[PDB]
Write an enzyme that holds these catalytic residues in place. Structure first.
Site, PDB file in Angstrom:
ATOM      1  N   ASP A   1       0.827  -1.195   0.000  1.00 52.20           N
ATOM      2  CA  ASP A   1       0.000   0.000   0.000  1.00 52.20           C
ATOM      3  C   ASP A   1       0.862   1.245   0.000  1.00 52.20           C
ATOM      4  OD1 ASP A   1      -1.882  -1.982   0.331  1.00 52.20           O
ATOM      5  OD2 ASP A   1      -2.170  -1.589   2.439  1.00 52.20           O
TER       6      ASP A   1
ATOM      7  N   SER B   1       1.517   6.697   1.653  1.00 50.49           N
ATOM      8  CA  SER B   1       0.722   5.655   2.288  1.00 50.49           C
ATOM      9  C   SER B   1      -0.656   5.721   1.660  1.00 50.49           C
ATOM     10  CB  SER B   1       0.640   5.832   3.795  1.00 50.49           C
ATOM     11  OG  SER B   1      -0.397   6.727   4.104  1.00 50.49           O
ATOM     12  N   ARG B   2      -1.019   4.696   0.893  1.00 49.09           N
ATOM     13  CA  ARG B   2      -2.274   4.718   0.162  1.00 49.09           C
ATOM     14  C   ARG B   2      -3.490   4.570   1.060  1.00 49.09           C
ATOM     15  NH1 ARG B   2       1.331   3.345  -3.471  1.00 49.09           N
ATOM     16  NH2 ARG B   2       0.985   3.916  -5.660  1.00 49.09           N
ATOM     17  N   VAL B   3      -3.317   4.078   2.284  1.00 53.50           N
ATOM     18  CA  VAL B   3      -4.395   4.175   3.258  1.00 53.50           C
ATOM     19  C   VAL B   3      -4.570   5.623   3.687  1.00 53.50           C
ATOM     20  CG1 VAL B   3      -5.193   3.438   5.488  1.00 53.50           C
ATOM     21  CG2 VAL B   3      -4.059   1.822   4.013  1.00 53.50           C
TER      22      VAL B   3
END
Ligand SMILES: Nc1ncnc2c1ncn2[C@@H]1O[C@H](COP(=O)(O)OP(=O)(O)OP(=O)(O)O)[C@@H](O)[C@H]1O
Ligand SMILES: Nc1ncnc2c1ncn2[C@@H]1O[C@H](COP(=O)(O)OP(=O)(O)OP(=O)(O)O)[C@@H](O)[C@H]1O
Ligand SMILES: Nc1ncnc2c1ncn2[C@@H]1O[C@H](COP(=O)(O)OP(=O)(O)O)[C@@H](O)[C@H]1O
Ligand SMILES: [Mg+2]
Ligand SMILES: [Mg+2]
Ligand SMILES: [Mg+2]
Lengths: 539, 478, 523
Positions: free
Chosen positions: B319, B344-346
């Site tokens: 992610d 951070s793709r979250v």
């Protein structure tokens, strides 16, 4: 019972056994060769054939030559009887002084020590080199790697570490020359005769180094195993003698390169850049044997040649992980004439921790690296602007870092034979305090090249005095200097008269010892009976 | 089966008629092996150990069972090898259960949204690239840049906050050491016992002298041991240190089994290798327990070249990405997190809500400082909308520095970042760096930490008291 | 399929004899009907299975050794390289168009060997020993193996004797020693062959002067070059009289790839005679970057698996076992010597190539000749920062050692300011003073071709530059001013500087005196 030669492709021999195959890593002896040809079994090819690597040259091997099995790997002499000797890969003496009188010969192949017998003690090994002892301080009982390209000074650095550590150590040393020049092997042997580290004759037992040499003239099966032989002598001194050992390996890169040289003949398709697919596990299987167990301690210094100055080549990039300390020598530092050419940034150590060497040492090390990284970032705007609009802080962080760059250089005791300046051993406290002075700014009143090739901080101060008496001088130029003739100078035709005479007889020494045999004009060959017969008249 | 050929850790075995792909076998010599490529004439067995004890014509028995490790709470605190067997010398693993190392990752319905935060104690990571529970975050960097430092601080901080949370929200860490030296694994066990971190840390260790299948297989061992905690409603944290070494071990085995190589001589299924490993780090659904597993793969670049094969593969898989530069490291910025290249793709959905309202200013003005980065080296001052962001971004990068093995609770990082983004900065001359970075968290009263931890948000009733507390900070060294 | 039933099959279990009794009285009549098409069977001789691209695969040859000269029935020689189980792979020393399938191959008994001795002195030789100059065969000569191992750690001694090359950039900046292997590396047409030729010509100039045992005997190995260039080189050597001490081994481009591969070993075996018999040798492996391409051709056609740039695995060993033979022997073995000058060509200055990094790793020094300095008038195009030497001092002229360290460091100061000469600020008459002083030194180091200088004239001419006597001279005409320094100064200071070996203060006074009396043409 015995086996016979099935196939010879360069340094890799296939040997066929009618029953009783040897184990892998077994050494086999080729009976009937010119020299002692030892083959070490590498793999089982499958139809009662093993594949081996030769420890000597295979020129002269006939198919069907009888190869006998010793039932064990290459066993070398180890112990006190090897101190002050030079050995082969296979444990033969190559120093022309009897055999080796060592007891309990040991296999050169064993497993690494376990996880339960690992030491975590971290004591600093003071080297006397002020860039090593400040920015990447070594660990006694640690694995040290001197990286660098060709000609940046890995061998002169390993000679200075020998001269500074191995003479004042108490324990024993093992130099393991792996695929290096035979010239510097002889230079090491001779200057350890002259140092007392190797003594010949009746007081051989008072020596403190065992040389094990596998140099560049040897075939790739020999360079790939001579590090194991030196490691076996060191592991005897660690495990049986219980000693503190100092292993010095010159170009452990040649171990991986020599394994790569036979890798396609052993039948393995190549990995990335051209190394064997087993590069990491071969290097790990060697490097994990160099440990301090709970029994004894091996401090290893390894020179690691990086090919074409490329630190991302997989043979240095793999051996980076096995090292506690790391001394990256670079060409860029050496092109400024600063020796040892240690990259102060790219060098790293596990000891550079404020809990290990102390916070006072740690902060001057991090401060030197901070000012050097700031100057490395300012050089690009200096070369565009010209270093007169740098805010009087970045004229200070350039001047202090340029003083520090010179102050990291040092004369070496083993490098006075091609530079002239005698070498300075620098203590650790006189390094830490001396760099703390140039960092905080006590020594902006000294000129910048006064820090170049000196010892302590008490020597830059007096090199400034010598430089400023010498730039105070050269102001008289009239007469009564050496150029006048009645000072002490004879006539110029008088000096030609004192030349002693050497003769030239114009025959240059070619008619004194030659056995001029008469060579065959015709080709002489062997028939089916093996008889020497001239080449038969039919094409 | 009968050994046909053996060499370089690969045994070609004739026979073994009904053997499974990936099944364990056993030799006459007591060494084990895994049957990897099953061919019509032989079986390619990779050997779990030194192959010098195997000869041609040695007998191979199949064990009938796929490779499996002991999982359970008896693995906590124990240093195991890559196959589960304990190498610390405290006897056998009591209170465990065998379970397969190659399981299927949980599907679309078994997932849940990654919403609860996983704090690492590194304030750079907690402020800029925040980690959630169930995230795969890549700790990527060059050599010697501090990747093991970020991993170790996450583990040590999980120990520190595991003592003050209930039984449910505790994170049990697994550190997998692939291809490392054996002397540096023991220093980590020393640090984790001296820290106290081994009460929750499993330690899987496949060192450099281990066989290539053990280093290939040790991340799957560690992922099974942490999937125990994921699959029982608890939280895990798995750290694969140098996944770039597990790929090299797999390349060695696949090349010696003569599988056709691809780019940089890796096999074709090395993306399948790493994604098959890293898709098991998941935040499970409410029906499967609600447990989670958070992975930190570590990938070593060479010259910052993240366009290399394995680095691009794992950047594609994970992610986020924590990119550590070497130029920030020697410039004093340690942890050397490259702020512009770390993702951070979250994202902000899984950070501290008290940090989320303070760090949104922080990353914005750090970006503003990064675009105006040449002007720091100039003598001619500009228009003081750039000099303002220059001094502000400089004190903000000096804000995010952190010493090693000393992680910070999340309420203290929030307060120290609040004290630098709201304008309580050291706008004095900076002779007082020694008594002003820590002075904020040491001189405000700890009641604001209790309120900020228990509410999780700087309320209007609390930034009032925090602004009142921040003004009365002494620094009496001046 | 397993072997135990397959060797249980050697037991007779026929259980009938209605074919064993029938075929046996029918077979020998049938072999008679086609015995005209039967080639006679071979055990100890050879028979060519396949020939192609210079590789014969030879059936038979049961007792050949590895690396052995075999001889085909058409007279062309070979070498048994890889000894397979079913055949022998022979690399052919010559044109393989004369070899057919079914030719008999005759084992000669001997490992590959070349004629060595004093009768090779003066001859032009191919890569195997045959003289190609048409002056008859080699007389006063004995055979010797081309594949001896290098002298070990106890056979050697320290490299101390200087070995002047007559190129003063070399003799001042990167000084060779007497048992030293110094690499001449550079791009094409930068003057690598020229540096090697000035070394050989200068050794002829000094051999007519020293007492009989400091004389250096040269060997030129000309691998891969065209035959016209070797003819030009033999013409040059014989018109300067240097062919009396020079052997030339010449495996040209039309020769078979094993001759180009083997000619450095042939030349090293010829030059090892002088090392082993107390004399002093010097060898130039010109285009050692072509021996590796010929070895790659042989190994790819013998079907050995390729590597980096499709070179073999053992291409490092190819050059390491060759260059390690260049040594300085101990007094217990004569005190002889053999100094190597391998020549490696780069492509576009990429010194990071494979064979370049191997030979850089083997040899002691480097002599880097860059193509961007060759077009700035700096000839020989020696990159001073990049050309190293391992011996440094203790193996050069003492008088040059007095006057050359202050040249080596001053050129480092001169290169230190070249990246700060694009603006023109000219700081405080320092970065502008060395900007002419080093520019005068680099003009001092230039010299012509085929004209080496004796060492005393070089250490006078660089005494005259790193001291005073030249700062009032324009940078345009120091190459002219040096002949004023060399010729007009009394030629008796040269003899006493040669005979002392250093600059004594008795001689320093007269040398500074006579460096003020001459006329420098700079105006
Ligand atoms: N935040 C920090 N503060 C101070 N020192 C640090 C910090 N982070 C790392 N270091 C130091 O940097 C050195 C290298 O760190 P670390 O081992 O974490 O990096 P790495 O990338 O894992 O290196 P390798 O790849 O060689 O294992 C260590 O000695 C550590 O003490
Ligand atoms: N010192 C010099 N002064 C002037 N010209 C020179 C000098 N040295 C060499 N040259 C010229 O440079 C050209 C190239 O020289 P040389 O053949 O020695 O280089 P090379 O690198 O061996 O070339 P090749 O790779 O083509 O063999 C020659 O034509 C020669 O005339
Ligand atoms: N400390 C030093 N002082 C002066 N010169 C040095 C020093 N170290 C190395 N050198 C120079 O570097 C050259 C090569 O050093 P060496 O140790 O042989 O490097 P390598 O091991 O990479 O071949 C030598 O010619 C020497 O002149
Ligand atoms: Mg070296
Ligand atoms: Mg690490
Ligand atoms: Mg040429």
């Amino acid at each position: 019972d015995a086996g016979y030669v099935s196939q010879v492709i360069g340094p890799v021999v296939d040997v066929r056994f009618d029953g009783e195959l040897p184990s892998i890593l077994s050494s086999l002896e080729v009976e009937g060769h010119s020299v002692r040809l030892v083959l070490e079994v590498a793999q089982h090819m499958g139809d009662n054939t093993v594949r081996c690597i030769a420890m000597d040259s295979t020129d002269g091997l006939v198919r069907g030559q009888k190869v006998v099995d010793t039932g064990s790997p290459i066993k070398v002499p180890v112990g006190r009887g090897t101190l002050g000797r030079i050995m082969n890969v296979i444990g033969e003496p190559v120093d022309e002084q009897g055999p080796i009188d060592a007891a309990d010969i040991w296999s050169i192949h064993r497993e690494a020590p376990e996880f339960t017998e690992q030491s975590t003690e971290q004591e600093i090994l003071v080297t006397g080199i002020k860039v090593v002892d400040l920015l990447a301080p070594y660990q006694r009982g640690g694995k040290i790697g001197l990286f660098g390209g060709a000609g940046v000074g890995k061998t002169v650095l390993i000679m200075e570490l020998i001269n500074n550590v191995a003479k004042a150590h108490g324990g024993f040393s093992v130099f393991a020359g792996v695929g290096e020049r035979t010239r510097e092997g002889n230079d090491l042997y001779r200057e350890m005769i002259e140092s007392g580290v190797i003594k010949l004759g009746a007081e051989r037992g008072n020596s403190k180094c065992t040389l094990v040499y596998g140099q560049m003239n040897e075939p790739p099966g020999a360079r790939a195993r001579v590090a194991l032989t030196g490691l076996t002598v060191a592991e005897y001194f660690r495990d049986i003698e219980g000693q503190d050992v100092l292993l010095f390996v010159d170009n452990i890169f040649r171990f991986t390169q020599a394994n790569s040289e036979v890798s396609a003949l052993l039948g393995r398709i190549p990995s990335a850049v051209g190394y064997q697919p087993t590069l990491a596990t071969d290097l790990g299987g060697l490097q994990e044997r160099i440990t301090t167990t709970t029994k004894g301690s091996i401090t290893s210094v390894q020179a690691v040649y990086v090919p074409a100055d490329d630190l991302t080549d997989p043979a240095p990039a793999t051996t980076f992980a096995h090292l506690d300390a790391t001394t990256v020598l670079s060409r860029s530092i050496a092109e400024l004439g600063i020796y040892p050419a240690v990259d102060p940034l790219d060098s790293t150590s596990r000891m550079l921790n404020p809990n290990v060497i102390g916070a006072e040492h740690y902060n001057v090390a991090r401060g030197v690296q901070k000012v050097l990284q700031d100057y490395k970032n300012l050089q690009d705007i200096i070369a565009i602007l010209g270093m007169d609009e740098l805010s009087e802080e970045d004229k200070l962080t350039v001047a202090r870092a340029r003083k520090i760059q010179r102050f990291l250089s040092q004369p070496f005791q083993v490098a006075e034979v091609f530079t002239g300046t005698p070498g300075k051993y620098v203590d650790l406290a006189d390094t830490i305090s001396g760099f703390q002075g140039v960092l905080t700014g006590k020594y902006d009143d000294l000129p910048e090249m006064a820090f170049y090739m000196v010892g302590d901080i008490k020597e830059v101060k007096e090199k400034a005095d010598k430089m400023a008496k010498d730039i105070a001088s050269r102001k008289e130029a009239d007469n009564k200097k050496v150029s006048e003739e009645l000072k002490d100078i004879p006539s110029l035709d008088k000096l030609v008269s004192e030349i002693k005479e050497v003769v030239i007889e114009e025959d240059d020494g070619l008619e004194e010892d030659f056995k001029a045999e008469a060579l065959s004009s015709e080709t002489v060959v062997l028939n089916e009976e093996g008889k020497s017969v001239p080449l038969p008249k039919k094409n | 089966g009968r050994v046909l050929s053996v060499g370089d850790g690969i045994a070609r075995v004739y026979g073994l008629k009904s053997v499974q792909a990936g099944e364990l076998v056993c030799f006459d010599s007591g060494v084990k092996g895994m049957a990897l490529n099953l061919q019509a004439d032989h079986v390619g067995v990779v050997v779990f150990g030194n192959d010098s004890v195997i000869h041609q014509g040695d007998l191979v028995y199949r064990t009938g069972q796929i490779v499996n490790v002991p999982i359970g709470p008896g693995t906590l605190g124990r240093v195991t090898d890559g196959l589960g067997q304990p190498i610390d010398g405290k006897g056998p693993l009591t209170n465990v259960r065998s379970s397969l190392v190659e399981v299927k990752a949980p599907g679309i319905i078994a997932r849940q949204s990654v919403r609860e935060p996983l704090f690492t104690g590194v304030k750079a990571v907690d402020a800029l690239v925040p980690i959630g529970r169930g995230q795969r975050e890549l700790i990527i960097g060059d050599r010697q840049t501090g990747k093991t430092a970020v991993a170790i601080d996450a583990i040590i901080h999980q120990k520190n906050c595991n003592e003050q949370v209930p039984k449910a929200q505790r994170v049990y860490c697994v550190y997998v050491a692939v291809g490392q030296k054996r002397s540096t694994v023991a220093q980590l066990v020393k640090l984790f016992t001296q820290t106290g971190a081994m009460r929750y840390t499993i330690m899987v260790s496949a060192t450099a002298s281990d066989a290539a299948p053990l280093q290939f297989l040790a991340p799957y061992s560690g992922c099974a041991m942490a999937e125990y905690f994921r699959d029982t409603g608890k939280h895990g944290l798995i750290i694969y240190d140098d996944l770039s070494k597990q790929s090299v071990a797999y390349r060695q085995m696949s090349l010696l089994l003569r599988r056709p190589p691809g780019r940089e001589a890796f096999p074709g299924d090395v993306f399948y290798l790493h994604s098959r490993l890293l898709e098991r780090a998941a935040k499970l659904s409410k029906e499967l327990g609600g447990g989670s597993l958070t992975a930190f793969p570590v990938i070593e670049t060479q010259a910052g070249d993240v366009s290399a094969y394995i680095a691009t593969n794992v950047i594609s898989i994970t992610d986020g990405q924590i990119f550590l530069e070497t130029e920030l490291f020697y410039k004093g910025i340690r942890p050397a997190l490259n702020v512009g290249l770390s993702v951070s793709r979250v994202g902000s959905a899984a950070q501290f809500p008290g940090m989320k309202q303070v760090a949104g200013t922080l990353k914005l003005e750090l970006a503003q400082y990064r675009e105006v980065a040449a002007f720091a080296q100039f003598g001619s001052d500009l228009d003081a909308a750039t000099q303002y962001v220059l001094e502000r971004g400089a004190r903000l990068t000096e804000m995010l520095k952190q010493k090693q093995f000393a992680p910070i609770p999340i309420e203290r990082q929030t307060v120290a970042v609040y004290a630098a983004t709201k304008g309580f900065l050291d706008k004095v001359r900076v002779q007082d760096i020694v008594a002003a970075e820590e002075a904020v968290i040491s001189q405000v009263n700890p009641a604001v930490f209790k309120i900020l931890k228990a509410n999780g948000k700087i309320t209007p009733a609390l930034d009032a008291h925090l602004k009142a507390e921040l003004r009365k900070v002494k620094l009496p060294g001046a």
